[PDB]
Amino acid sequence: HARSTGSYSLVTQQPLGGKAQFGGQRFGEMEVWALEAYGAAYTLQEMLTVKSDDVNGRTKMYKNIVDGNHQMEPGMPESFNVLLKEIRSLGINIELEDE
């Protein structure tokens, strides 16, 4: 199986095969540690942000990949952005402070 850009799950925006063009490989906790033992921060950021969970960063990346500019404008992963609303859905006020 191989996938470049396929469909995405509705509940959480994540790679999911809808065409039988299979969703990408699942990057787990152990693989994160494997990246953590190496000094690779950007590989890890792109792994859990632009390549998967960021509904913005993914398209902003794709346009850069065809334009010839290798960069990432990561933003915040939609999983954590959803987790904020679930916490905030309770009586818990969770804010991002300072600047």
Partner 1 sequence: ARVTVQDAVEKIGNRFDLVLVAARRARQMQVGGKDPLVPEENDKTTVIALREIEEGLINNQILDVRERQEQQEQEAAELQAVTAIAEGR
Partner 2 sequence: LKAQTKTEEFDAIKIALASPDMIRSWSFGEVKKPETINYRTFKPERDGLFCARIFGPVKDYECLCGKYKRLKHRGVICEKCGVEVTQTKVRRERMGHIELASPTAHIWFLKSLPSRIGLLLDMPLRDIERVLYFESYVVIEGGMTNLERQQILTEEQYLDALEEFGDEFDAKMGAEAIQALLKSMDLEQECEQLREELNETNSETKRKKLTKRIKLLEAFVQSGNKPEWMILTVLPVLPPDLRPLVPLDGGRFATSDLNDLYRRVINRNNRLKRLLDLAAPDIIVRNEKRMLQEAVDALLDNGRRGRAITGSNKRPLKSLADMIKGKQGRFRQNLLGKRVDYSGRSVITVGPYLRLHQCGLPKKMALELFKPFIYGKLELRGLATTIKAAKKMVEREEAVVWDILDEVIREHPVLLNRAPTLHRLGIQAFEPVLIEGKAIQLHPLVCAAYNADFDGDQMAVHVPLTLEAQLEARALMMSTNNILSPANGEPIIVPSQDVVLGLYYMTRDCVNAKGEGMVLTGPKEAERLYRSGLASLHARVKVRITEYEKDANGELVAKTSLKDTTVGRAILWMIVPKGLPYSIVNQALGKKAISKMLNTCYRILGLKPTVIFADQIMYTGFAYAARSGASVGIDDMVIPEKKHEIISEAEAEVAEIQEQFQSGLVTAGERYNKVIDIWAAANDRVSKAMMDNLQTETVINRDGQEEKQVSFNSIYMMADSGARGSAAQIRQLAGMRGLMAKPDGSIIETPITANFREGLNVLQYFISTHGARKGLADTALKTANSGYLTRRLVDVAQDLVVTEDDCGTHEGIMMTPVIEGGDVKEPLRDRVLGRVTAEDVLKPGTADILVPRNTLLHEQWCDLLEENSVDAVKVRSVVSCDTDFGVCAHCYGRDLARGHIINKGEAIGVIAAQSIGEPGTQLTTGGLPRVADLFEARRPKEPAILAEISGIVSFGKETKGKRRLVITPVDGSDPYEEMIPKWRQLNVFEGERVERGDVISDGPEAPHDILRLRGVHAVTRYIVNEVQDVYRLQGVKINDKHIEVIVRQMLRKATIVNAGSSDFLEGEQVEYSRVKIANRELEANGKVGATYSRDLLGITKASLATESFISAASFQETTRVLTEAAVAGKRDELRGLKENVIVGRLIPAGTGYAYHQDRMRRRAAG
**Distance between CA atoms of residues 83 and 38, nearest Å:** 28
Which does residue 60 touch among partner 1, partner 2, none (CB within 5 to 8 A, set by kind)?
A: none
Segment 64 to 93, residues that bind partner 2, using CB under 8 A: 65-68, 70-72, 74, 76-77, 79-80, 82-83, 85-93
DSSP string, 39-90: T-SHHHHHHHTTTTT-TTHHHHHHHHHHHT---------HHHHHHHHHHHHT
Q: How far is the CB of 58 from partner 1 (least distance, A)?
A: 21
Q: Is 69 an interacting residue with respect to partner 1 (CB under 8 A)? A: yes
Which does residue 29 touch among partner 2, partner 1, none (CB within 5 to 8 A, set by kind)?
A: partner 2
SS3 21: coil
Q: Is 68 an interacting residue with respect to partner 1 (CB under 8 A)? A: yes
**Distance between CA atoms of residues 70 and 60, nearest Å:** 11
Q: How far is the CB of 54 from partner 1 (least distance, A)?
A: 21
Q: How far is the CB of 33 from partner 2 (least distance, A)?
A: 5
